[PDB]
């Protein structure tokens, strides 16, 4: 007696028995807007997606409440869901982020498979027997696609006679795959290639939402009629509708251990496949090696590196996000954190892996471990508009500017030992960068006469680097072992470059530049935000040419491209803090020790006390 | 004691001649951007221009009596001076290129200089001698002089940059000014000769004034008010520091406004304006477009003139050999005019506000304003029947020809149709017909009918795409129309015979027509021009005015022949009719009614 399992917006539901007594059982319930479901039968698992909660979840078939969040981030319209009962993975399409991804059956080791040339991918079917997953994306040009469940050999099989190509489901007995259509109102049928496209229920009668099957019988939903239907597997004949008066049936599967035929796993319980991900594959070994998103795989294969090497950190108004720079996929932002009101400036310390950032409604500086409970506060007192912040990763101090109080101030990274280095009456400090070797700190500031100044790392030797033809200078990156210093200006709308001493000057490109501007450099590339702050460009600093790595991301405020862990440069401050008991501030001549407000430097020129 | 007054954007302030002394703002209200500044010590009053408000205002030193004296036809009133003797207000506008004058309270405004003006900036008066001086900031800056009536204009000093703070040392007969291009303060006698440089080592001099043996100036760079020996340029001290954006400065003392002339006494017996002149003491003046009567003392308003409206203004211009400047009528009610007409009987101006969707009324004075149609209603065009005292108008919403009395009460609809869409309309009550454009979908046409809606007929249905304006000449029985799409002006007999194209070249967008004597005036929205052709063809197409933005309508006003007017059978008692009074071919009158009424046995009542 085939049990049918189906989503229902408000709950997941199991029905059929032997098609009698109308025992539709509310498997899970109290959901909000459920779309897709699936199961791994052996483990007694039921998964679904929720479009209002933008999460994918799972429960235990037994009498229990047990529900676990499985994905709860990075999702917009997960409308297709397929469990891999063999390789033990979870696949799912998202029709609005236009991605296709995979994870372990606990949401972990989450890898993005495909993300290019996808228009509203929906229905999804796995063939763990082979290494083939099938799905349908539809849009300006609809199509059904095949590829390996490993990310390989993306083949377009059916690309004609389709419009809104509908539910996918495969006959393992016959090595044929069926599909429907939410517009042209047919059911078809082919071989697992694009081959032998036969009609099973041609003619405009079926208006199926989701197809399944069990022993010669095609079942499906027609939301309109609020019904479930069924007919011969071979012709349209037999077309009765199973008992169904159901409040918006969506996704549906035959809930039967027979619809998941078990077999040999391409990796054993041995190996566990690789180090992170063993995905099934058509390729000879029949399994393949994978790392999570943004993580590259060693030349040996089978072993994933540790995390990303470079990394592009975003600050939006109300969240932080990181894009990796190790992989082509890019637009995999991923975020974190709580109580972020209005983020402005961002920076990072590779040594301890703390992200530092400013928020100018909260009026505070904070730090975190990325996707880590890093979160502590750092500064919260006497702050106005922290429009720029810089980590000194050698002396282990934190610099930040302030627009409301027109100051530059330094503290140790933990916000201890605060000391005002610069406080100008007219001009007001905005964006700031550091050179802990060479002992310079450069910064843009606005004002009646907008200039770009520089000084030693204690504010001592003020030199005005740039003075003329600058309206509102914004970003300010630093190319180190090339001695150039890149910046922008909102008023004039052009990104210029310069010699480290203020001489090699020249427009690099013209650009319409936002007032709050994200702008950073790392490895030949420059990254900035567009005029509408919904997109980020990658530009060659040596080659001048532009590119857009991610759009449709509003409220971008500030960026920082950075190595993770990797650190460069040094000076004697790194030696037990220069011998200074509090603040050690490096200069070209040589370090100078300083003190928090109220303290006094003794003739040691090394020590502070309270008088 | 003599004290110093200066304008400073949002406020006007007073200080003493003493260094670092107290600096107090005159308690004024609603000042946005004060620029030009003068005073009237005898009346204890200050006058200032606001280039943001586009106005000239005055008030007492105690801030009381804040009133606007000029609030129309201003663009950039950068220059302004008080004639304390004749009690007149002079001002210059760099945007409108005009030097104007009026009474100190603002009435009887008149244009003194309008030709060959290229940005008049600063203005200094010498009513005792009958001369006025001003600086000019064109391609070739200069300092000109003229009689205080605008006569005898001549350049006094030609070799100068943008001069400012033009001030006269009356006692010692000299002129001082700053130069914004050479950063110096110069001086010369009242003839522009004996030209000396008082100070040259100045970074950014702007304002200027003098009193006794010192000159005071402002400096935008040093943010200051400094003074120095007026002849030497030395013994320099700073009076005030840290002053941002000091526009104009002046010395408030009685000794600055002395002297006398024939105008100070009974206003020279002048009916309106008393204007001092060097040779002859003074001359009597009149408001714009007014004529000075044979008595050399009184004025008469213009009898015939031409009205052209824009989006935000209605202008009047006369046809003189002198080419007198057009002026903006001071109607406060104006916002978005779409069409204009004029009742010569009561001498009042009618227009349609396209935004507030009403037909308003007011005399050229701007006073006696009154709404005659309000609301759905969406008036498109109007045509006044001056005999029956009726307005025939068209509604873009209900697609009808509606007729309303001048006082506000309705007569009724005279034309309504399922597929009919009346737009442009002109009534010819002398013959008993009305003419209008009927913009039916995909087949535009020009029609005629009796003033009651009967005897409809199509005059023209081909050679049309956008019949956009109508005009007729009752005396010559001619009809004129303009087509926006076909870019041409056509003519015909009232009957519709003898259709002839008048002009079909170098036209882009005609939107208004009007007959003035033997000429056909029309306005081109895109070309931004007023042009005219001779209906007789004897003389050639002539440009009247260029660079007029957002032209909406133009309308000729001829002097009403009261006697010839009363000859009309509907002139009095409306021909004994209750509603519409039609004129038979034999000069006899019937009575008709709107669409909703019927003529009774009285053959007079509806």
């Amino acid at each position: 007696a085939p049990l049918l399992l189906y989503a229902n917006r408000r709950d997941l539901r199991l029905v059929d028995a032997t098609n009698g007594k109308e025992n539709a059982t509310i498997v899970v319930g109290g959901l909000e807007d459920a779309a897709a479901v699936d199961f791994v039968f052996s483990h007694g698992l039921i998964y679904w997606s929720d479009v209002s909660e933008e999460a994918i979840k799972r429960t235990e078939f037994n009498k229990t409440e047990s529900v676990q969040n499985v994905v709860v981030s990075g999702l917009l319209s997960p409308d297709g869901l397929a469990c891999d009962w063999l390789g033990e993975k979870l696949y799912w399409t998202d029709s609005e982020t236009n991605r296709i991804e995979v994870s372990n059956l606990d949401g972990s080791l989450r890898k993005v498979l495909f993300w290019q040339e996808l228009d509203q991918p929906r229905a999804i079917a796995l063939d763990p027997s082979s290494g083939f997953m099938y799905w349908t994306d539809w849009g300006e040009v609809p199509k059904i696609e095949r590829a390996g469940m490993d990310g390989s050999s993306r083949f377009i099989i059916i690309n004609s006679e389709i419009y809104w190509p509908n539910g996918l489901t495969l006959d393992y007995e016959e090595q044929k795959l069926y599909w429907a259509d939410a517009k042209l109102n047919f059911i078809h049928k082919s071989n697992l290639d694009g081959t032998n496209r036969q009609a099973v229920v041609k003619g405009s009668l079926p208006h199926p939402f989701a197809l399944t099957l069990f022993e010669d019988i095609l079942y499906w939903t027609d939301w309109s009629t609020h019904s479930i239907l069924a007919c011969n597997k071979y012709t349209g004949e037999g077309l009765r509708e199973i008992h169904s008066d159901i409040f918006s049936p969506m996704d549906i599967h035959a809930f039967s251990q027979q619809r998941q035929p078990n077999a040999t796993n391409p990796c054993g319980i041995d190996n566990g496949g690789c180090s992170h991900l063993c995905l099934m594959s058509p390729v000879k070994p029949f399994y393949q090696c994978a790392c999570p998103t943004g993580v590259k795989l060693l030349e040996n294969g089978k072993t994933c590196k540790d995390g990303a090497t470079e990394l592009l950190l975003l600050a939006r108004r109300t969240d932080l996000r990181r894009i990796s720079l190790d992989t082509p996929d890019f637009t995999d932002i991923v975020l974190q954190l709580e109580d972020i009101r209005h983020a402005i400036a961002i920076d990072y310390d590779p040594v301890e892996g703390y992200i530092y950032w400013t928020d100018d409604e909260v009026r505070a500086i904070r730090r975190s471990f990325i996707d880590g409970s890093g979160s502590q506060f750092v500064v919260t007192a006497q702050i106005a508009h922290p429009d720029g912040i810089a980590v000194d990763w050698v002396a282990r101090n934190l610099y930040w500017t302030d627009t409301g109080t027109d100051r530059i101030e330094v503290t140790r990274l933990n916000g201890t030992m605060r000391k005002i280095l610069i406080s100008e009456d007219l001009e007001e400090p905005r964006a700031i960068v550091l050179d802990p070797m060479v002992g310079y700190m450069y910064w843009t500031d606005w004002g009646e006469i907008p200039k770009i100044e520089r000084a030693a790392l204690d504010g001592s030797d003020r030199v005005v680097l740039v003075n003329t033809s600058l309206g509102w200078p914004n970003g300010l990156a630093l190319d180190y072992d090339e001695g150039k210093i890149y910046w922008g200006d909102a008023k004039t709308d052009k990104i210029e470059v310069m010699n480290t001493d203020g001489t090699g000057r020249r427009v690099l490109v013209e650009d319409k530049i936002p007032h709050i501007f994200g702008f950073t450099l790392l490895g030949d590339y420059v990254y900035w935000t567009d005029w509408q702050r919904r997109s980020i460009e990658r530009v060659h600093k040596r080659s001048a040419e532009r590119e857009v790595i991610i759009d449709q991301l509003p409220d971008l405020m500030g960026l920082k491209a950075t190595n993770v862990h990797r650190v460069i440069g040094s000076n004697p401050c790194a030696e037990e803090n220069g011998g200074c008991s509090h603040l050690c501030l490096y200069r070209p001549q040589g370090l100078r020790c300083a003190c928090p407000i109220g303290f006094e430097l003794i003739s040691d020129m090394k020590t502070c006390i309270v008088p | 004691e003599a004290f110093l007054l200066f304008s400073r954007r949002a406020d006007i302030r007073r200080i003493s001649l003493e260094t670092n002394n107290n600096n107090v703002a005159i308690p004024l209200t609603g000042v946005k951007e004060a620029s030009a500044l003068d005073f009237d010590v005898t009346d204890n009053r200050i006058y200032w221009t606001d280039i943001s408000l586009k106005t000239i205002s005055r008030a007492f030193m105690n801030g009381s009596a804040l009133e606007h004296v000029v609030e129309f036809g201003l663009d950039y009133p950068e220059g302004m001076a008080v004639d304390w003797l004749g009690k007149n207000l002079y001002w210059a506008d760099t945007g409108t290129n005009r030097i104007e004058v009026s009474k100190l309270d603002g009435q009887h405004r008149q244009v003194l200089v309008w030709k060959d003006l290229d940005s008049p900036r600063a203005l200094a008066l010498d009513p005792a001698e009958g001369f006025m001086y001003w600086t000019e900031w064109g391609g070739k800056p200069k300092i000109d002089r003229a009689a205080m009536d605008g006569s005898e204009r001549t350049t006094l000093v030609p070799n100068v940059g943008r001069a400012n703070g033009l001030t006269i040392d009356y006692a010692k007969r000299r002129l001082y000014w700053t130069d914004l291009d050479t950063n110096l303060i110069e001086s010369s006698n009242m003839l522009g000769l004996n030209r000396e440089v008082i100070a040259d080592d100045l970074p950014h001099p702007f304002g200027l004034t003098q009193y006794q043996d010192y000159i005071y100036w402002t400096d935008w760079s040093r943010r200051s008010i400094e003074r120095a020996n007026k002849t030497s340029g030395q013994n320099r001290t700073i009076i005030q520091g840290h002053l941002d954006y000091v526009m104009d400065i002046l010395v408030f003392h009685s000794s600055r406004q002395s002297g006398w002339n024939e105008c100070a006494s009974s206003n020279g017996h002048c009916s309106h304006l008393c204007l001092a002149v060097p040779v002859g003491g003074f001359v009597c003046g009149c408001p714009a477009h007014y004529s000075l009567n044979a008595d050399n003392r009184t004025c008469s308003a213009p009898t015939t003139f031409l009205l052209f409206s824009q989006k935000s203004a209605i202008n009047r211009m006369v046809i003189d050999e002198q080419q007198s400047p057009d002026i903006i009528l001071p109607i406060h009610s104006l916002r978005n005019v779409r069409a204009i007409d004029y009742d010569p009987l009561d001498k009042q101006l009618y227009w349609i506000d396209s935004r507030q969707n009403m037909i308003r009324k007011a005399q050229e004075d701007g006073s006696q304003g009154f709404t005659v149609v309000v609301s759905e209603i969406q008036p498109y065009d109007l045509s006044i029947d001056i005999y029956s005292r009726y307005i025939y108008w068209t509604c873009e919403a209900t697609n009808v020809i509606n007729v309303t009395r001048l006082d506000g009460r309705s007569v009724g609809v005279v034309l309504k149709g399922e597929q009919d869409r009346p737009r442009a309309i002109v009534v010819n009550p002398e013959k008993g017909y009305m003419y209008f454009t009927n913009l039916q979908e995909r087949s535009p046409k020009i029609e005629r009918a009796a003033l009651d809606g009967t005897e409809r007929e199509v005059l023209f249905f081909s050679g049309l795409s956008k019949p956009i304006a109508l005009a007729l000449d009752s005396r010559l029985g001619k009809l004129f129309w303009a087509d926006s799409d076909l870019r041409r002006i056509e003519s015909s007999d009232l009957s519709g015979a003898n259709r002839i194209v008048l002009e079909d070249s170098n036209i882009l967008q005609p939107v208004g027509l009007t007959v003035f004597e033997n000429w056909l005036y029309w306005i081109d929205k895109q070309q931004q021009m007023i042009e005219k052709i001779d209906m007789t063809g004897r003389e050639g197409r002539t440009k009247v005015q260029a660079r007029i933005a957002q032209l909406s309508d133009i309308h000729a006003v001829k002097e009403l022949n009261l006697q010839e007017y009363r000859q009309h059978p509907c002139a009095q008692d409306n021909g004994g009719c209750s509603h519409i009074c039609l004129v038979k071919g034999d000069g006899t009158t019937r009575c008709s009614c709107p669409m909703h009424l019927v003529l009774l046995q009285d053959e007079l009542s509806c």
Binding site: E448 | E33, S52, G139, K140, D181, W220, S221, R547, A549
Partner: protein, 76 residues
């Protein structure tokens, strides 16, 4: 497009023979200078920032040079 005196924001908002120059505390369309016409020459860099009565540049094939003290638009 913008005519002389018309409020503008960029020279592109103005007509062919005009540029967007500031007058007081907004910008309006002003005409380009022609041969013989007086042009602006700033002494101090800062005087440029303070100018509220801005002239347009010299027209095509004209250079702002000194007379042979004012500066006028002259041909190369």
């Amino acid at each position: 497009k913008g005519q002389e005196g018309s409020v503008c924001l960029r020279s592109s908002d103005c007509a062919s023979g005009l540029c967007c120059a500031r007058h007081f505390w907004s910008k309006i369309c002003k005409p380009v200078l022609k041969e013989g016409q007086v042009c602006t020459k700033h002494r101090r860099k800062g005087s440029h920032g303070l100018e509220i009565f801005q002239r347009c540049y010299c027209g095509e094939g004209l250079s702002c040079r000194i007379q042979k003290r004012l500066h006028t638009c002259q041909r190369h």
